[PDB]
């Protein structure tokens, strides 16, 4: 209870008003501060113990951001729109050594969100589900985190069907993008760690912190 899709949508709206790799990294760092604010706007998130709020954010920040800029790029032809309002095209990503992962973002996420015309309410519920990941290690009470996740997709399921009566399977379709998001989020992390190791590519404070241990 007390997990309405109206609150989630508001959250999504309340936050988002020369090297391409360095640009994408600065946008990520900038979006991390906003991500925290976003999470606080998701009902019940703040009522959880601070220790679990840290685990959930550190555990899902990457997928939370990939999902956001992906939906934001729905109007971009072959590229993505960065928080800094700057663009990154397929060719530019390819010329930076990250062509493969960039394309997976376009094919598995961006293009798909556009084809099904995923709305901001659906995106928010998806992100809230990711946020409330009960598999996160360290959680003091993985039970409550699981309870929250269930309420999110429950309100989402109701939102769907009602908003899209012609599409009985729209709900399941949404959830089925999560496996791709997990995989793509994991590949993004491997890249980042390598970048940090090498030394090149400027990495801001907040983004650097997420790459810390554990």
């Amino acid at each position: 209870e007390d997990m309405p899709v109206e609150r989630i949508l508001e959250a999504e709206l309340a936050v988002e008003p020369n090297d391409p790799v360095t640009n994408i990294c600065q946008a990520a760092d900038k979006q991390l501060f906003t991500l925290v604010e976003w999470a606080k706007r998701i009902p019940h998130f703040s009522e959880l113990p601070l220790d679990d709020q840290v685990i959930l954010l550190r555990a899902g920040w990457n997928e939370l951001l990939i999902a956001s800029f992906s939906h934001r790029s729905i109007a971009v032809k072959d590229g993505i729109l960065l928080a800094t309002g700057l663009h990154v095209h397929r060719n530019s990503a390819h010329s930076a050594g990250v062509g493969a992962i960039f394309d997976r973002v376009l094919t598995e996420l961006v293009s798909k969100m556009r084809d099904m015309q995923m709305d901001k309410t659906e995106l928010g519920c998806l992100r809230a589900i990711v946020l409330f990941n009960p598999d996160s290690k360290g959680l003091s009470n993985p039970a409550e985190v699981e309870a929250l996740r269930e309420k999110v997709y429950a309100s989402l399921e109701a939102y769907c069907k009602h908003k899209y009566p012609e599409q009985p399977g729209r709900f399941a379709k949404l959830l089925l993008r999560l496996p791709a998001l997990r995989s793509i989020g994991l590949k993004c992390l491997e890249h980042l760690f390598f970048f940090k190791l090498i030394g090149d590519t400027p990495i801001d404070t907040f983004l650097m912190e997420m790459l810390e241990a554990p």
Binding site: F33, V36, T205, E209
Partner: peptide, 11 residues
Amino acid sequence: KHKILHRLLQD
């Protein structure tokens, strides 16, 4: 550890 993250969540 996790300096930044804690400060932002607390405020």
